[PDB]
Design a protein around this ligand. Structure first.
Ligand code: ACP
Ligand code: ADP
Lengths: 250, 252
């Protein structure tokens, strides 16, 4: 009878990934050197080596896999704290905590999600008294969801709050040389909302920028795109807002 | 700034797949050089040297992670002992030392039953009943000691009891009956040579040898398991002192 599986520490995985990278580099310089030769079974000897390195890396990536709980678990308290600090009442729900990602993806996607969450609590959800007056459920609900679907990983943040004012976006868009009135009426809903990812889409204020990349919504897309992922927004007045983030799953 | 997470853990099911692939990786290197012999191309060797450097460096730390302390088998022993000790009605004072000494995981589950066997031995044939024990002027309390430690590049596992010891003469005379040796040859035998008869496949038993199995319970298969890990096993037994079995396993 047997007792199972084993704990390691980062430094080893760190040391492992370093050599993995060096292995990739070395394999590439070999293929470049012998690229001039056209020998038949030399190709198969090289292709075999590549196949090994790939399958070797492919296993490493399966070790890299990590539950998104590492980040999600930090949230319910922060959402709780943010809610009362901003004088709001929110019912916060997490779904798909078990969904597993590459370790790199998880320790990147953390801050952008926290941002989107704060956005929902701050600008999204109306004060309780306003919700009751409009016929909406007294307490706003906030859903952070992560699912394995297709060959991608889909993370969604959804709220039933105010929603986003598209006209305010369009007017600001024209306010500083982006479009005019004519090419404004030709815009789909999503590409209107896509203005929010423009660097410093300004109703806010200038920022002096140190040590980082940026401050707000333009950074979310930046992080997502650094992971070769995708992002867009759905919203309409007095119904709610949903941000969808898709990440390539390997 | 980034966001912090924690430390991880993983299974061995694909951890052995690393070694398997990396063991298959060094093969892929040589196969290239060998196909570089047929057509004679030598200017690459600087790049193929790093591959050996990397694979080795890779091979080391890939296996350097799978070292786990020995308490993941040792801690299931003490009540696997006390229950069969009373099963044979004998008292055993079980003591484990060096439980925090570590070795490869793929070893510890294949070293498990052999260790259990040596323990089962020491209880049964090793430790004599208390009446016989107090009649032998020995302390009435039977003390069985399981031990593990670092020594050089090897891990030393020791199962030591204080029992009747092993009758070396019974071994010699049994060996003479089987025609392995005779009195002339037996007179020159060292204690190691004598005890090594216990590792002879059809020696220490009266029953199972010819057409029964390839798999049997005995000290013969215990040795095979040890050197299936490319290790070494040794026995030391003084008479009425006790029996001390030693297993040494490699590292790198
Ligand atoms: N869930 C949501 N519902 C309503 N409006 C939202 C929203 N998410 C963002 N917005 C709007 O988009 C504009 C910009 O968001 P951005 O993320 O760049 O701002 P911010 O960095 O100022 C967040 P904070 O309040 O956390 O400082 C907001 O100022 C708000 O008017
Ligand atoms: N710790 C020990 N003390 C005394 N005798 C032992 C010890 N271990 C093994 N022996 C002797 O070695 C013989 C072979 O044991 P083994 O090969 O394990 O199978 P079995 O225990 O079924 O005989 C036993 O008959 C026993 O007399």
């Amino acid at each position: 009878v047997i007792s199972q599986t084993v704990r390691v520490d980062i430094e080893k995985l760190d040391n492992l990934m370093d050599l993995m990278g060096e292995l990739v580099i070395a394999r590439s310089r070999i293929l470049e050197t012998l690229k001039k030769y056209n020998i038949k079974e030399l190709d198969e000897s090289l292709s075999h080596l590549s196949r090994i390195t790939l399958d070797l890396q492919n296993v490493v990536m399966k070790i890299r896999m990590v539950p998104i709980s590492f980040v999600f678990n930090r949230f319910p308290r922060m959402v709780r704290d943010l809610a009362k600090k901003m004088n709001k009442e929110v019912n916060f729900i997490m779904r798909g905590e078990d969904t597993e990602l590459d370790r790199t993806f998880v320790e990147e996607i953390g801050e952008p999600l926290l941002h989107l969450l704060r956005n929902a609590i701050d600008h999204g959800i109306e004060p309780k008294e306003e919700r009751i007056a409009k016929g909406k459920p007294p307490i706003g609900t906030l859903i952070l969801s992560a699912r394995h679907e297709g060959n991608n990983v889909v993370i969604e943040v959804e709220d039933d709050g105010r929603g986003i004012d598209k006209e305010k976006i369009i007017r600001k868009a024209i306010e500083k040389g982006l479009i005019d009135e004519s090419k404004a009426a030709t815009l789909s809903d999503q590409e209107i909302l896509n203005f929010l990812f423009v660097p410093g889409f300004s109703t806010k204020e200038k920022v002096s920028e140190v040590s980082g990349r940026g401050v707000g919504m333009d950074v979310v897309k930046n992080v997502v795109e650094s992971l070769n992922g995708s992002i867009s927004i759905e919203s309409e007045k007095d119904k709610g807002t949903k941000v969808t983030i898709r990440l390539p799953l390997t």
